[PDB]
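Dataset card, provenance and construction

Sequences and ligand SMILES were collected as paired inputs. For each pair, a complete structure of the chain with the small molecule in place was predicted and serialized as structure tokens. The example below shows a pair involving zinc ion. Curators did not alter the output after generation; any descriptive sentences attached to a record were derived from the structure itself.
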Amino acid sequence: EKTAVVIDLGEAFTKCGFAGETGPRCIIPSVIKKAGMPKPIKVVQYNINTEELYSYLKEFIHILYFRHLLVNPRDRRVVVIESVLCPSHFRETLTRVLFKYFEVPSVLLAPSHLMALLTLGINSAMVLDCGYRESLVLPIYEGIPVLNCWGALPLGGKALHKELETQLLEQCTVDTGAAKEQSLPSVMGSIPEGVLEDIKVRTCFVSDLTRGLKIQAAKFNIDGNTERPSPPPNVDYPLDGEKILHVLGSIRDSVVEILFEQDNEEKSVATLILDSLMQCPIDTRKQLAENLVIIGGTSMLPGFLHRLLAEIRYLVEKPKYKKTLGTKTFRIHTPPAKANCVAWLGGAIFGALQDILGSRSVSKEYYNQTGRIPDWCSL
Amino acid sequence: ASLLQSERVLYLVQGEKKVRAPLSQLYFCRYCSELRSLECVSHEVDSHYCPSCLENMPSAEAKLKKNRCANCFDCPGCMHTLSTRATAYYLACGFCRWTSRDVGMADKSVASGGWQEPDHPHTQRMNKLIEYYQQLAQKEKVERDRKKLARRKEIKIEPAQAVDEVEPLPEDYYTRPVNLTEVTTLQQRLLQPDFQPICASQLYPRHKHLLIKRSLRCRQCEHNLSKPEFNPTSIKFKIQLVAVNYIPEVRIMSIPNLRYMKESQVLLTLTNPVENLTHVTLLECEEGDPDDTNSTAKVSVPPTELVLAGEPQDFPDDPDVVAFRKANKVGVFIKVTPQREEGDVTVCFKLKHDFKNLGAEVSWLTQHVELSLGP
Amino acid sequence: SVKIAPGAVVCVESEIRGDVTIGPRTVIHPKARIIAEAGPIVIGEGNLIEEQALIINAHPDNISEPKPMIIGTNNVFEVGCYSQAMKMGDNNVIESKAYVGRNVILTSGCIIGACCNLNTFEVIPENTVIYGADCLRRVQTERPQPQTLQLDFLMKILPNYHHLKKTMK
Amino acid sequence: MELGELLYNKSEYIETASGNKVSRQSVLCGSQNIVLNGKTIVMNDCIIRGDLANVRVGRHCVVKSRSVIRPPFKKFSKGVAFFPLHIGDHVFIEEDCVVNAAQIGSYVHVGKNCVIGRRCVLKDCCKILDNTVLPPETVVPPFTVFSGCPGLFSGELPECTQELMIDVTKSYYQKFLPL
Amino acid sequence: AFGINTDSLYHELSTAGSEVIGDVDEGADLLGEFSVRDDFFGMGKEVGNLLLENSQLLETKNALNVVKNDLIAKVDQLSGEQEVLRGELEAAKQAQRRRFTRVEMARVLMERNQYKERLMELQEAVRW
Amino acid sequence: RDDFFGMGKEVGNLLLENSQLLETKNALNVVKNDLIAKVDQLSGEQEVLRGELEAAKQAQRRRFTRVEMARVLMERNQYKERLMELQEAVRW
Ligand SMILES: Nc1ncnc2c1ncn2[C@@H]1O[C@H](COP(=O)(O)OP(=O)(O)OP(=O)(O)O)[C@@H](O)[C@H]1O
Ligand SMILES: [Zn+2]
Ligand SMILES: [Zn+2]
Ligand SMILES: [Zn+2]
């Protein structure tokens, strides 16, 4: 029997390759380039019309299946890793291109959270996907995804890119190099997303808890007379050769504080862990809070896990969680891959089990004379 | 191919999806007498060839080598094939001046057999988890067939140990200037997905990816539409069935001005040795979905015979109808009443001809050709 | 005004205008337009000018004042390049179809790559490789590279195919 | 959409015995070594270096205006020379190019204002787009579009380049009428 | 004209003697030509078409080497189907070192071809 | 004298190269005829083993590639000893 193909359609980056390996064969941006378009278009789009998404997904998995994978489509089973509460018409169009166009034997619609848990050998953990769009938490308990205690906030990479564009147009200092070497604020209209994510992954970083609370208090100025700490030095980042943008050092440690902004709703990144934990049953809480895994491509910002653990240990002393989740010990697992590909590594672990992969999946003859994909919703 | 602007003429394919394609990207099936587009036809994989050293290598060897060539390396700076260099041997790039001594590996005394990738460090845990979960999949496998007939050695792995205190941020991130040459961008960071390094001194070069010679199979009758030759640097195919060797093509050379009347000229070219053509259909009356039309063509003609070589030209002259008659190439005047919209003048008209099915030469096909002008 | 030292093969099809001082071992290819406008040009030891290396000293025309150029030792200019630099070091290559703007100082051993239009008021540091038309992207080189053997080949094959420029003693 | 009537001055171009059309302003150094066999076109100020090697082009080759072809240089084991580049048949070199290639294959369109580096090998029926830079010692495959600023692989050509490039360069030779 | 013309460019542009001297070349220095002796020029052209006679034998050798390597792709597929059908009929009836040597030989052959290919281009150069 | 003797050496060297290319062409045409006859008898053996099965139902690679490569090395050899003499016939 030939090996399975494991594909995770992310929002920013699609992770792809063969099952049973120790890493993905490709990580690509999830964009396609048509004829005449000056910008590449994102292939994943929710609540748009059907045939455009079908044509975009047909060109993208044709590029994925004959440029990175080098293998026939009608020979092997596909494990398609999707998020929990992914949109159902997007799942229906993805199964329609993977069954009607490529004509594979069997796709398997796989939640990313349970095969983020699968790479450690454990069966019950708190799981948190810090993706491009959402920051989605879930409890997995003995192989059951606890759907009653989910929690999502739109604090992904897209909010970080919008915040970085807002502070860069607030303090833009470019040097043109055509006798315009002084401060020239916002001579371009909008910074592109690739240069914004390159500034975010090359220059920006995550501050500490005690530094970040003083950064929030100095931004607040509630009787704080210049009580900010020492910022990092300014970084001269280039755009297209001659343009040199001086990124200020306050931006490099203050643009990531919107993940841990309080603003009186108690809705930050670390609060939805405790907000999912307070709806759990009381027999699950100790060895649900003893096993926290953090997946998702935001999670390899430097210092992010230490800031998240210190923010959890600061937020445990609040009186809303002191009576219920007060005396808890919080530990973080180390997954064996990097945090972009934990869900892929468990999907490639699950795709190598060839005895159960034909039975735990949707066959193409079942899609031929039913036409309906299973879901967690009603039928 | 792109020197003539080949997107100006488009042909309507007929299948489940009606797309418009240029004739360079169209294939014609012979068993079903119907041209097929690239988006409505099936694709295969024939062979794997490295683009740097053009040598073929088989499929199980590619599955062993993980779709990577055994000799050629791509640099981490740009995406360019590295070259070996003597002093005793070290790798260096041509576009950027990235050498092998930037990442700190020693020079190998042999040129080809000394460079290899480091292994993944967590492959022992991955193999232990695979050999645990295959045993658990067998223990779940033996119950469902037992349930089906009722209707009709243990290995445990030590799991991962969570830490109560993760490794924090270093204090040298504060109060130290970053170096943009030293840190890596995300595009060359995600070309090493096993370990993604921050610094450029931990970014080892990868091997060269391979490409695919593609075979094409028709989805109605499973026959090869274009099977290439197996040996690379080959131009001849084992079997080709392309539309520019079977169908007649229309081409434009004379575009007049857009003052609401035009008499343009096209040429009909030929692939068959003797054929008949007719542009007499004026794209019906809002039929066949001509939704991209923006003008109105007269295009009235009788059928014209056409002869390729490797009293048909003296008697039926018709200089308002047939402009010129060279070898396998006949010019036809079309009267356009253009510019019904603000811009982008397009003309849809149908084309009837004859083809040999192989009586069998009286198989008549109607081709819906949508051609665009500069407006 | 064309002061050519002996040993240097200069062909006659290269358009050389103005006060230049050609050094001992240089090679000038055909269609090599070196024009001196505001001041003299000094070209040192063995700088192989190859094809359209357009070298212009019109500083005040585009935008006392002698203002010369100094060009050092083994400075090879490739095909279609555009050089305008009042101080230039030794052992350094600029590549094909590159643009160097006016106020660029060059020290030893640096690569200017293909089609990189660089124009800044900046001294180029030691052994920096600028690549790409899109951006600049410096990378350091640990070793200054040599070039002699192509021009010691090129002394012996050029005068039996081309005529030679005049030479003082 | 095919090529129009490009007009040239009758006293400007020299029409040879086999069918070659060379401009007078195209400097070509060392004309005893350059072999131009078929009905080729060398346009105005196209610098051809027939010094240091021999240049042999194919049948219907169009070298456009202000473009430089030259042999490359290779460090030998014993003693150095310049490699004789051999352009194949039906090759469309566009304007303002720099060619330092060795063994350009047949039926290739080479796009406008591009640099091909030293000892770069072009195989048959490939295509290079506009404003690209190829590095030294690169081999491009057949039916391949190479584009981009480091000269990467970009796309795939249609399979009927062989039935099209003959028609393109023969129509370009037959649409070359004097003024 | 004919299919090929190996008359270089000096003998094709020396019909008038002024344009090749002035415009497209320097044209000087090697003004001494070579008497095309009725037999020196003819038996020099006898090498120049026989090298094309060698080149057509080389490309037909490269044509049949496609056919041999395509035939051995279909020998082993019928062999692998023959062994599977033999095992099914039978059930119905009831070296690493060598591979490394092969790899070494392949590398060596590659080196040889690389040297050959070029060296025949330098022998193509010094034929003229 | 010298130029005539020098290129009459080249006529003989190109004549021996044209001889060995035709001998290699004969030696691979013989094995192409052997391969098409062997795949014809294997097709006959496969229809016999299909029909009798239907009636009843009613380091090799190493050695081979190795031989071929030794042959290749031999060929390259009878070439790099000839063209080194051709390359010193450039040198004179
Ligand atoms: N090495 C890295 N360091 C920091 N940030 C990174 C790194 N790699 C990717 N990112 C960022 O992480 C985000 C993408 O995360 P991830 O790959 O998990 O998303 P996805 O799977 O594409 O999306 P989604 O889960 O919403 O479908 C982007 O903002 C990207 O810039
Ligand atoms: Zn390779
Ligand atoms: Zn590089
Ligand atoms: Zn068909």
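Derived descriptions for this record:
Chain B touches chain D through 38 residues (CB under 8 Å).
Residues B 50, 52-53, 69, 71-72, 208 surround zinc ion (ligand 2) (CB under 6 Å).
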